[PDB]
Design a protein around this motif. Structure first.
Motif, PDB file in Angstrom:
ATOM      1  N   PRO A   3     -57.655 -42.296-118.115  1.00  0.00           N
ATOM      2  CA  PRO A   3     -56.448 -41.846-118.819  1.00  0.00           C
ATOM      3  C   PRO A   3     -56.345 -40.326-118.876  1.00  0.00           C
ATOM      4  CG  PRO A   3     -57.512 -43.602-120.047  1.00  0.00           C
ATOM      5  CD  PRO A   3     -58.441 -43.252-118.917  1.00  0.00           C
ATOM      6  N   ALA A   4     -57.482 -39.665-119.062  1.00  0.00           N
ATOM      7  CA  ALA A   4     -57.522 -38.211-119.137  1.00  0.00           C
ATOM      8  C   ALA A   4     -56.913 -37.577-117.892  1.00  0.00           C
ATOM      9  CB  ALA A   4     -58.953 -37.733-119.329  1.00  0.00           C
ATOM     10  N   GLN A   5     -57.028 -38.272-116.765  1.00  0.00           N
ATOM     11  CA  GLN A   5     -56.488 -37.775-115.503  1.00  0.00           C
ATOM     12  C   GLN A   5     -55.111 -38.367-115.229  1.00  0.00           C
ATOM     13  OE1 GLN A   5     -59.208 -36.046-112.939  1.00  0.00           O
ATOM     14  NE2 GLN A   5     -59.484 -35.418-115.077  1.00  0.00           N
ATOM     15  N   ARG A   9     -51.081 -36.365-114.339  1.00  0.00           N
ATOM     16  CA  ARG A   9     -50.059 -36.540-113.320  1.00  0.00           C
ATOM     17  C   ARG A   9     -48.747 -37.009-113.942  1.00  0.00           C
ATOM     18  NH1 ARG A   9     -50.468 -40.126-110.483  1.00  0.00           N
ATOM     19  NH2 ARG A   9     -52.255 -41.562-110.504  1.00  0.00           N
ATOM     20  N   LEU A  10     -48.837 -38.036-114.781  1.00  0.00           N
ATOM     21  CA  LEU A  10     -47.666 -38.590-115.445  1.00  0.00           C
ATOM     22  C   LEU A  10     -46.992 -37.557-116.349  1.00  0.00           C
ATOM     23  CD1 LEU A  10     -47.701 -41.963-114.999  1.00  0.00           C
ATOM     24  CD2 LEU A  10     -46.973 -41.787-117.385  1.00  0.00           C
ATOM     25  N   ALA A  15     -40.404 -38.653-110.307  1.00  0.00           N
ATOM     26  CA  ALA A  15     -39.562 -38.464-109.136  1.00  0.00           C
ATOM     27  C   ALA A  15     -38.744 -37.180-109.219  1.00  0.00           C
ATOM     28  CB  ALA A  15     -38.651 -39.654-108.983  1.00  0.00           C
ATOM     29  N   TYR A  16     -39.209 -36.249-110.035  1.00  0.00           N
ATOM     30  CA  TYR A  16     -38.526 -34.971-110.210  1.00  0.00           C
ATOM     31  C   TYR A  16     -39.500 -33.808-110.057  1.00  0.00           C
ATOM     32  CZ  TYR A  16     -34.220 -32.626-111.626  1.00  0.00           C
ATOM     33  OH  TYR A  16     -33.055 -31.896-111.640  1.00  0.00           O
ATOM     34  N   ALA A  17     -39.285 -32.995-109.028  1.00  0.00           N
ATOM     35  CA  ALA A  17     -40.145 -31.847-108.770  1.00  0.00           C
ATOM     36  C   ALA A  17     -41.585 -32.283-108.522  1.00  0.00           C
ATOM     37  CB  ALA A  17     -40.082 -30.867-109.932  1.00  0.00           C
ATOM     38  N   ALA A  18     -41.959 -32.377-107.250  1.00  0.00           N
ATOM     39  CA  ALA A  18     -43.308 -32.785-106.877  1.00  0.00           C
ATOM     40  C   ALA A  18     -44.349 -31.832-107.458  1.00  0.00           C
ATOM     41  CB  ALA A  18     -43.439 -32.854-105.365  1.00  0.00           C
ATOM     42  N   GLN A  21     -50.547 -29.401-105.438  1.00  0.00           N
ATOM     43  CA  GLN A  21     -52.000 -29.531-105.456  1.00  0.00           C
ATOM     44  C   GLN A  21     -52.584 -29.288-104.068  1.00  0.00           C
ATOM     45  OE1 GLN A  21     -53.945 -29.295-108.125  1.00  0.00           O
ATOM     46  NE2 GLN A  21     -54.206 -31.421-108.797  1.00  0.00           N
ATOM     47  N   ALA A  22     -53.814 -28.785-104.028  1.00  0.00           N
ATOM     48  CA  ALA A  22     -54.484 -28.505-102.765  1.00  0.00           C
ATOM     49  C   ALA A  22     -54.737 -29.790-101.981  1.00  0.00           C
ATOM     50  CB  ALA A  22     -55.792 -27.772-103.015  1.00  0.00           C
TER      51      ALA A  22
END
Length: 23
Positions: A3-5, A9-10, A15-18, A21-22
Motif C-alpha cells: 500500500p505504501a507504494q 502511484r494512485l 489517466a491524467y498526466a502520466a 519515472q526513470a
C-alpha cells in the motif's frame, strides 16, 4: 507490492498526466 507504494502511484494515476519515472 505494498500500500505504501500503491498509494504513491494512485496519488495521481487517473489517466491524467502520466508520470516521469526513470525507465
Amino acid at each position: 507490492e505494498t500500500p505504501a507504494q500503491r498509494q504513491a502511484r494512485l496519488l495521481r494515476m487517473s489517466a491524467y498526466a502520466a508520470k516521469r519515472q526513470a525507465s
